[PDB]
Design a protein around this ligand. Structure first.
Ligand SMILES: NC(=O)c1ccc[n+]([C@@H]2O[C@H](COP(=O)(O)O)[C@@H](O)[C@H]2O)c1
Ligand SMILES: NC(=O)c1ccc[n+]([C@@H]2O[C@H](COP(=O)(O)O)[C@@H](O)[C@H]2O)c1
Lengths: 245, 246
């Protein structure tokens, strides 16, 4: 029936003393989800364990609204369904369809800016649910942070797509874990953004792996195999519903 | 039963395409553990064969090497077979052949099978025992058996002592090799000495970058890092269930 914020895999009581509870949010098109998108969560989990004082409590996929001005974007409920099946075996990853459900007065899909997405997660976990219980018994605000590849930081540093007020909210109140791989040179983007350099965590990608959703759609159109680039249940879903022609 | 049975449950013995020579791909490797890259290599070879050759793919076989190969990080053969089998159970065309891991000498010890003898074994089981592959014209033909390999295996063929020159001649004159070339890397010079034993060599360019090697997966496992989404979930579950890779 109606929208319920997913919590079936949210750790609501911490296990590690002295650690700040953390929730990771991946905002993207996910058209379709790939193994790289999923691997980025695991890389972020590993980095947090050994390089921060955070304790990871959940990972959320946030598929973008159908109103987003982008090519190759399948219908929102399909992208949500593909993501959900991809993370069904995961013990800690969930999909939040919130962005795909936003509608304007006339009922058309309405785009949700990333700053408003992060406030939505902040609201559901910390205001509605009461935060995360520590080993000290204190229910705390989970830190909410974005999880994105290097292209997102480069996008944030170029004027035109991000308003200064949103950038300030996103990076000063929440933060971003950024996966950086070989060949990508994000040095200039960090320079233009270094006033927030303390809520920006750059994670080196040790194993090179650059599969994009765009390449996956191309392969689907040319009748090339996408097995082992995206999860099996997503391959089946795409075939069952004839997505991406 | 307890005795060895050649797997054929996904073997296509009837062709669907006219004018095509039937082809069986054999990946000889350690698979300790199998990764998504090993599986992707079969799909890339399938894509290449369909659109760039006059072959028709009839099966893909994983052939985990004998424990007698004695290499660092080589888990027990029955474990590697189980990991490959579970990894490939959802596949429509890939199978695991435990033949190499089941080979034993007189002393009951694992006995190494050189790759040339592995290909002869596939030739024997598919073409001699089973009688080959029927074409769309109703004519029964021998399937071409060919190796599917990455660049490290091809480069090893140039390591003196490792592969007999006579085995290389059999492998490359009678069977062949589909070779995955990583993006940015140029393996042509390593190939140069090998195109001298007939040109039954097909190079498949890998456009999508992917370096998930078994060596890196073992390192991550030793350092207590996650390998989920680098290797199949059933392999992750098997490794945790049996405590493999320290
Ligand atoms: N001003 C903004 O909030 C803004 C601008 C550009 C992109 N984005 C977000 O970044 C994500 C882009 O995802 P993709 O990399 O899959 O295209 C989307 O969630 C998009 O909404 C937000
Ligand atoms: N003389 C030979 O037949 C010979 C020599 C070295 C390696 N090999 C084969 O090459 C494969 C190497 O596999 P990996 O790259 O996964 O370690 C194995 O199947 C191994 O048996 C064969």
């Amino acid at each position: 029936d109606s929208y319920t914020f997913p919590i079936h895999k949210l750790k609501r009581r911490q296990s590690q003393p002295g650690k700040t509870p953390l929730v990771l949010v991946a905002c993207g098109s996910f058209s379709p989800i790939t193994f790289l998108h999923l691997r980025m969560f695991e890389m972020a989990s590993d980095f947090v364990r050994f390089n921060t004082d955070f304790e990871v409590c959940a990972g959320y996929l946030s598929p973008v609204s159908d109103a987003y001005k982008k090519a190759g974007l399948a219908p929102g409920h399909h992208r949500v369904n593909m993501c959900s099946r991809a993370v069904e075996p995961s013990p800690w990853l969930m999909v939040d369809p919130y962005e795909t459900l936003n509608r304007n007065e006339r009922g058309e899909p309405e785009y949700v800016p990333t700053a408003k997405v992060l406030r939505h997660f902040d609201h559901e976990i910390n205001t509605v649910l009461g935060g995360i219980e520590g080993t000290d018994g204190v229910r705390r605000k989970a830190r909410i942070a974005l999880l994105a590849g290097a292209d997102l930081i480069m996008s944030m540093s170029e004027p035109g797509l991000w308003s200064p007020t949103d950038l300030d909210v996103i990076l000063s109140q929440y933060g971003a874990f950024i996966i950086e791989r070989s060949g990508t040179d994000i040095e200039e983007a960090l320079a233009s953004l270094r006033q927030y350099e303390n809520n920006i965590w750059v994670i080196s990608q040790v194993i090179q792996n650059d599969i994009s959703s765009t390449k996956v759609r191309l392969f689907l159109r040319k009748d090339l195999s996408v097995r082992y680039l995206i999860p099996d249940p997503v391959v089946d879903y795409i075939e069952e519903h004839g997505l991406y022609q």
